[PDB]
Amino acid sequence: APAAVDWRARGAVTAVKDQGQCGSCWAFSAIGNVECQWFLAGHPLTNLSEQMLVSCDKTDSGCSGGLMNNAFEWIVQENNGAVYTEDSYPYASGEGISPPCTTSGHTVGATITGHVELPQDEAQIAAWLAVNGPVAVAVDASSWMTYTGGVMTSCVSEQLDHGVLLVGYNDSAAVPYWIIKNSWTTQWGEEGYIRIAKGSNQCLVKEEASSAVVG
Numbered sequence: 001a002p003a004a005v006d007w008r009a010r011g012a013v014t015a016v017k018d019q020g021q022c023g024s025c026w027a028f029s030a031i032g033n034v035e036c037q038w039f040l041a042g043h044p045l046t047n048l049s050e051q052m053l054v055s056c057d058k059t060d061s062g063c064s065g066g067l068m069n070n071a072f073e074w075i076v077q078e079n080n081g082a083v084y085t086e087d088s089y090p091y092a093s094g095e096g097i098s099p100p101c102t103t104s105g106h107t108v109g110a111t112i113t114g115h116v117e118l119p120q121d122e123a124q125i126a127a128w129l130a131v132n133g134p135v136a137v138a139v140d141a142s143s144w145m146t147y148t149g150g151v152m153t154s155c156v157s158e159q160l161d162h163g164v165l166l167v168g169y170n171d172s173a174a175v176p177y178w179i180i181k182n183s184w185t186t187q188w189g190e191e192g193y194i195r196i197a198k199g200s201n202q203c204l205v206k207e208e209a210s211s212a213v214v215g
């Protein structure tokens with residue numbers, strides 16, 4: 001695996017979003033992953049709809065939480081692999097109330113065929129990411145509140161409660177790290193990103209890693 005990867009530098013990552021006062025993290029992570037996979041399968045960078053998942057995926061629980069893997073399953077088994085554009089299906093749960101699933105039509109922005117669950121192993125996730133792109137992961141984000149910058153090295157790592165997107169890593173640094181996209185605006189952390197130390201399962205980063213499959 002390479003020493004360092006940042007998918008943002010290939011132009012593969014969309015702007016940092018704002019989930020607002022809704023517990024839709026799982027959807028931002030899932031959709032983040034799909035946006036990057038669609039881009040890397042050859043299509044142009046498209047912003048996709050989280051609201052689709054929050055309002056329409058009934059295996060998950062909207063503003064009350066969910067799981068990226070359930071979202072990937074819902075997309076494939078209940079929605080024929082289709083993911084709508086953000087433009088046609090925009091986010092409306094910023095105040096913490098999800099609207100009902102829409103009964104209009106929307107523009108399809110991407111299509112997925114499945115997802116893979118990655119091993120529970122930081123090095124193998126890194127290798128898979130170098131080859132195939134950004135990975136949806138669950139983390140314990142209890143200690144993320146106070147984070148302003150740097151590489152977090154004492155992340156409380158007791159219970160998975162948050163979903164985010166790995167976009168890179170650096171194995172060469174003094175303190176190796178993952179580069180993680182969050183959904184709490186660009187005013188949080190490092191322009192909306194966080195670096196956590198790599199190699200010591202910080203925030204339980206390795207426990208629940210996965211990705212949609214395009215094509």
Ligand SMILES: *[C@H](CC(=O)N1C(=O)C=C(OC)[C@@H]1Cc1c[nH]c2ccccc12)[C@H](CCc1ccccc1)NC(=O)[C@H](CC(C)C)NC(=O)[C@H](CC(C)C)NC(=O)[C@H](C(C)C)N(C)C
Pocket residue numbers: 022023024025026060061063064065066067068137138139141145160161162163208
């Ligand atoms: C997304 C995370 C989130 O929005 N967060 C935070 O983690 C921290 C935040 O702000 C500080 C925001 C809002 C927030 C969450 N807790 C608090 C407390 C106080 C202030 C602000 C906040 C959501 C959050 C769900 C939620 C919503 C309202 C209140 C509490 C929690 N997290 C998830 O959806 C999470 C993501 C997984 C780990 C990828 N999913 C779960 O926790 C589910 C919960 C079910 C679906 C209700 N649990 C599991 O998936 C779990 C495992 C991993 C299989 N189960 C099945 C045991």
